Design a protein around this nucleic acid. Structure first.
Ligand code: ATP
Ligand code: MG
Lengths: 455, 98, 107, 87, 93, 95, 86, 107, 93
DNA sequence: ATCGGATGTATATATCTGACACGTGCCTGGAGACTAGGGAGTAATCCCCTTGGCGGTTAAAACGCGGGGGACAGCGCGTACGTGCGTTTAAGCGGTGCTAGAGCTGTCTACGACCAATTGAGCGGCCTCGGCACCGGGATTCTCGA
DNA sequence: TCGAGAATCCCGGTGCCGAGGCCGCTCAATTGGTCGTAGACAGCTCTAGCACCGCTTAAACGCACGTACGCGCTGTCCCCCGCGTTTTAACCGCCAAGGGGATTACTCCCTAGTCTCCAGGCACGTGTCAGATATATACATCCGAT
């Protein structure tokens, strides 16, 4: 069959050999009337491989057709700017904007069939589902396809109603929590082949009796390439855990929360995490009014206190920092801190508008890049984007899901980094943060020590 | 010149369209916040069923609508068309709850 | 012999046996007569039929073929006996009767 | 400073003026004085306090920690305003 | 566990009254609450009647008097007619 | 002569200080018997039963007159009127 | 044996009696149309109470209406009366 | 052994045994606990003492040594908690509270 | 036949409160009906509390909850204190 | 604005009187002691429902502005009502007779509780389709400036 | 006055979702005997409700007058409504955690039932004192001439 020996002719630029192998894998998958999970590690050109496969489908099999690309809201522009760069002949648009502009775009292009690729987000797929369901899609592509790890989610249910000739799933972290998530992803690709929750669960039941069976079962439907056996030029990450104490204010507030000391405290863990991040996240802690930002912020929070010294030292060495957080208000506190320290931040969060996200990414990635730090939230700004300019990643607080942090760190450890990437996870001593770190470590081991290791 | 309705026509239109419908007129989230804050003074750290909050909202809205009908009657009795705090107070006084 | 429900014997649709049990386990009296459940079930069935007939008429007047709380509310509030019986009752999702005072209407 | 944007300065203020106007329209009211809104908020607060106090008493007697729709229904029935449609 | 209700009986009465109309879940819940409320009212009045008269048994005439006390106007006459007719039919068989 | 309203206030004070019954007993008894004969012919009444009825009726009427006075004062008047009584009963929920 | 209505007994609630009741209610000035309305209101109230009392009496299989029957009827209407038993 | 009333054991004036009998012969529940009559008797005694204190003060205010229904009415209606408790209650031969609206007084 | 009243107990409480004050027969009858009314309210609330909670026993917990439900404000607190004191004294003896 | 004079109300005193507080005898209901059994408290389990914060979408809320119409004060004018007088009638009191009815007592006896075996009716779970909710587009109606 | 014009109503079309129908448990309602007691029936008694009559006198009724109040009209002003713009907070979906509620099994202890006293509460006289009644007096207050 077509083994595509060399770099695609129609594709501008030259792609590395493993990308050609991945494209060949996709072609073979297509011919054998099956669908797979392109699951290379975070940083390798999965998007380029998908675009090259689409270029093959349009130029060698002569099927321009309708193509659907579902991606997180922060990566729509990246998809557009790469389709227009590698195969600058495909008609592709983003179905985003107000419901008036969305209606205009639908009536003009979608219902006029004046398009080749429709890029959309997970929210616009559930919302503009009636016009989109009226198309016989040839390929339905889902970037960061671990969002459908739950089969009862409305996105999954809506997606199981479209008509599609074939499907493709892209994600760098296929296994999230347990094995049922993998079944939820596979039931979308091959609903007829698997179709079975209990059979899948009990054929496997979480030596060699099952793990090798895992490798044989997913062998035809999943392809993984690790960044160490493939790139061998990107330097590996040097991650460090900065254990910190607590401030007297933090000690007092932690004691008050644990000793049940009119405000409603129904989720103890979340309040303890808020205390460990910054005491000012609690209403009334900050001295005032009048409220001033002068210096009190930095010393009554141990994490911010360590961060100040590390950030100063890095600025002297001349590095640029990425700072991720689980909370958006803590990101406001960090905004105010960089205001007083006279830094140049480039915040993006879940409430940031589309064009604002585009502008922030380009400003931080622009040549000479006068911005110093990037403020992101691990959920909104922790997927797909390409902040390879920076070299230091600071994880201000850990997540219950270790993969949500792996994604965040790999926003700088990708193709075209040519630097040393240093990760500083900030952990608070003798708190709940150690508990979440332990649980995340166990969940990480569950999959990494077992299934994806041989890949 | 633009088109403006007389100062009392839109009001009748809203009266008709709101007496024809049956949905809840208060926003759910603010009402939930109010309920939890009020309840916090009797017992600390209570949980609430969604159906419980829904029942409270239904009862409260029915109560306020009936009170507004009584207030309207009092205002019309005073030969006005605007309702006033004195009208509300009189309605609650006659009902035996003040 | 062949079991025959007491509802069947009395020509009713409501459960005479269930009503009898609910009377016995309700701490209403030490002893419960034989005809009390029959009488009570017949009365309950009559009241149910009255409300349901009025609500079905109200549903028909709106060109609908399913009774909803709005129709129940309209039926109850539009006749005096049921309005007096359910005088202190709120029907959830029921609304109000359309009624504008005459002095508010334009001249 | 973007840390200190604002709070809603009470939860009773979340019963907004448009909502009170909608309730008045369902009640049949045509004009509304400007002082009606504070009065309505006070009245609603009193009503809610009574009902919730009774419901919480029922919940504590049942030795539970979550208020249920049945508790709310019993409290309303005790105060003399029966509610249909919740149990 | 099992929750018993009056839903099937209300549906039977509905099919007798309007053979072609349906009923929604919320409406059925409201009908169930209505039936329970009326049962409780009548049973309570009959109970305290029996207590007033120093009896210890709740009989069909206690139920009749409770119905007369509770139902208004023309509802009472028709409800009493229905109850008497049912009791006669039952005692005859 | 006393000006209109002086004797009315004296009567208000007198009758809010006293506690006896303000309707004559024989007319009220005749009214009770006449009303009762429409429910069961040839009824008999205990004297205490008739007294209980009079007590309840007078309490009900006095409370109604208090509410009617409030409605009249709300309408910026000092004379009570049938519309005042009707409004009071409508608000109380007896209509 | 013998029973009839004599002299239209609702007019035995005279105008002075109604004025005395109004004075106890705190009323200073009385319209001339209050009296007929008051008589109608009193008749309706008495009709409801006496209907319930007679229902109790004939359930008890008696022919005499008792103060306890009146008290039970008032409690049914929601107007408890202290001082006559119960 | 000699007998001691449950009221004396609980330090009350109201009768615990009579309350127990009335509880278990009034169709309230299948069973009655041992402490329920004691609690109920104590509560009833407390309320009685409250009302009688207020009525005795009222009777003294009139230079009388016997409590009458007028004194009971004055006590109940002047005390706000008791007025809420007895809001729907009529006291025979009680009268009303003296209260004239200020608009009716001479100018 | 005999008729049972609360008159002697009410008189004892009165002599405790005001040692030199009497009471007339009409006022005593009013107090008797007041005690019966409050008894009925509290016992009915306790009964339906036990019914709600699927208990077949009326205990001092039911009585205390019913008192809290029925009495307003300060009365409820003082009555609860009195009842608890009496139950403790009874149990200790 | 301020005295003079009627006028109604509260106060003190002496007098019955009938209603309350007291003392006596009985019986019935409460307390003590014992037994038996079943209701509820206790501990363990599990799984489900609540909580909290975020991400994106978007419709409602908040603010400002222009104007008209409704509330409120003032004035004048009948008219309806309050006050007082004289007259009569009917209510309240009392005393009497009577007889209908309500309550107590004793005796069955039919009816309701209890119990064990059994089966069928109701519930919970699982499926489809028809009724109802948007949705655009035309018709009709009503309002506001002429 | 009649011609714009904005809102509402049909009305046909589409989809989607919630109502209706079907299939296995399982538990509760039915059947058949067995008791025992709650109530129905007959008889008797006494009491209290009714009917009548006579007297008295206080309250109700009818009339007249004059005043003050309810009502209608006018004018003003201010405040609330209708409308447009922007953004912000609600809404819904997502994603974790874990606390709390519902179930089950076990046992013990607390309550009911029984029998036997016995003392406390009720009914019944009985004196006697708090209070209602009548009379005289002083005072606060209202209403009309200076
Ligand atoms: N053949 C190539 N030549 C040059 N650059 C490439 C090539 N392939 C990929 N890249 C670089 O990789 C970046 C694109 O990111 P990529 O498509 O690898 O994201 P991903 O790793 O697939 O997604 P995620 O990191 O979210 O899993 C681009 O900036 C591009 O410069
Ligand atoms: Mg990517």
């Amino acid at each position: 069959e077509f083994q595509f020996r060399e770099s695609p002719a129609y594709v501008n630029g030259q792609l590395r050999p493993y990308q050609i192998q991945g494209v060949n894998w996709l072609v073979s998958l297509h011919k054998n009337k099956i669908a797979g999970i392109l699951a290379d590690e975070m940083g390798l050109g999965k998007t380029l491989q998908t675009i090259s496969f689409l270029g093959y489908l349009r130029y060698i099999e002569k099927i321009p057709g309708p193509f659907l690309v579902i991606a997180p809201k922060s990566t729509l522009n990246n998809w557009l700017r790469e389709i227009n760069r590698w195969t600058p002949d495909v008609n592709a648009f983003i179905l985003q904007g107000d419901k008036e502009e969305r209606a205009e775009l639908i009536q003009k292009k979608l219902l006029g069939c004046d398009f080749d690729v429709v890029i959309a987000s997970y929210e616009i797929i559930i919302r503009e589902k009636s016009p989109l369901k009226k198309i016989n899609w040839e390929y339905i592509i889902i970037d960061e396809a671990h969002r459908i790890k739950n089969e009862e989610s409305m996105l999954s249910q809506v997606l199981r109603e479209f008509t599609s000739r074939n499907r493709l799933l892209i994600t760098g972290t296929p296994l999230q929590n347990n094995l049922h998530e993998l079944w939820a992803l596979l039931n979308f690709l091959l609903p007829d082949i698997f179709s079975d929750a209990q059979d899948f669960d009990d054929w496997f039941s979480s030596q060699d009796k099952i793990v090798k069976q895992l490798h044989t079962v997913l062998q035809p439907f999943l392809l993984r390439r690790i960044k160490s056996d493939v790139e061998t030029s990107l330097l590996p990450k040097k991650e460090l855990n900065l254990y910190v104490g607590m401030s007297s204010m933090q000690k007092k507030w932690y004691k008050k929360i644990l000793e049940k000391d009119k405000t409603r405290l129904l989720n103890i863990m979340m309040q303890l995490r808020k205390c460990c991040n910054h005491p000012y996240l609690f209403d009334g802690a900050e001295p005032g009014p009048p409220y001033t930002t002068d210096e009190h912020l930095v010393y009554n929070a141990a994490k911010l206190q360590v961060l100040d010294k590390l950030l100063k030292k890095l600025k002297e060495e001349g590095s640029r920092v990425l700072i991720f957080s689980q909370m958006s208000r803590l990101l406001d506190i960090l905004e105010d801190y960089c205001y007083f320290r006279n830094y140049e931040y480039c915040r993006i969060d879940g409430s940031t508008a589309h064009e604002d996200r585009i502008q922030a990414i380009d400003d931080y990635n622009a040549p000479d890049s006068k911005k110093f730090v990037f403020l992101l939230t691990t959920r909104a700004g922790g997927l797909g984007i390409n902040l390879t300019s920076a070299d230091v990643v600071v994880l201000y607080d850990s997540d219950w899901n270790p993969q949500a942090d792996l994604q965040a760190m790999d926003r700088a450890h990708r193709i075209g980094q040519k630097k040393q990437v240093k990760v500083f996870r900030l952990v608070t001593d003798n708190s709940v943060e150690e508990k979440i770190l332990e649980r995340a470590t166990q969940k990480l081991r569950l999959d990494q020590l077992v299934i994806q290791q041989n890949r | 010149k633009p088109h403006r309705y007389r100062p009392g026509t839109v009001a009748l239109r809203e009266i008709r369209r709101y007496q024809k419908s049956t949905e809840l007129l208060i926003r759910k989230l603010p009402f939930q916040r109010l309920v939890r804050e009020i309840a916090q003074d009797f017992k600390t750290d209570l949980r609430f069923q969604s159906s419980a909050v829904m029942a409270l909202q239904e009862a409260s809205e029915a109560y306020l609508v009936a009170l507004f009908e009584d207030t309207n009657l009092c205002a019309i009795h005073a030969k006005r068309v605007t309702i006033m705090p004195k009208d509300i107070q009189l309605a609650r006084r006659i009902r035996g709850e003040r | 012999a062949k079991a025959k429900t007491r509802s069947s014997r009395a020509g009713l649709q409501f459960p005479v046996g269930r009503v009898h049990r609910l009377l016995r386990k309700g701490n209403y009296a030490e002893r419960v007569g034989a005809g009390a459940p029959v009488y009570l079930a017949a009365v309950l069935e009559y009241l149910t039929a009255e409300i349901l007939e009025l609500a079905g008429n109200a549903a028909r007047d709106n060109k609908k073929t399913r009774i909803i709380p709005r129709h129940l509310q309209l039926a109850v509030r539009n006749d005096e006996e049921l309005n007096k019986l359910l005088g202190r009752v709120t029907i959830a999702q029921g609304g109000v009767l359309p009624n504008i005072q005459s002095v508010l209407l334009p001249k | 400073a973007k840390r200190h944007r604002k709070v809603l300065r009470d939860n009773i203020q979340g019963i907004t003026k448009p909502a009170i106007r909608r309730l008045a329209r369902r009640g049949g009211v045509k004009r509304i004085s400007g002082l009606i809104y504070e009065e309505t908020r006070g009245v609603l607060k009193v009503f809610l306090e009574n009902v919730i106090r009774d419901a919480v008493t029922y919940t504590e007697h049942a030795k539970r920690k979550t208020v249920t729709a049945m508790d709310v229904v019993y409290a309303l029935k005790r105060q003399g305003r029966t509610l249909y449609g919740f149990g | 566990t099992r929750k018993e209700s009056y839903a099937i009986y209300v549906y039977k009465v509905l099919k007798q009254v309007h053979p072609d109309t349906g009923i929604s879940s919320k409406a059925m819940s409201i009908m169930n609450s209505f039936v329970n409320d009326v049962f409780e009212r009548i049973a309570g009045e009959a109970s305290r009647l029996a207590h007033y008269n120093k009896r210890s048994t709740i009989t069909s005439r206690e139920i009749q008097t409770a119905v007369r006390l509770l139902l208004p106007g023309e509802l009472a006459k028709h409800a009493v007619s229905e109850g008497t007719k049912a009791v006669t039919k039952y005692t005859s068989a």
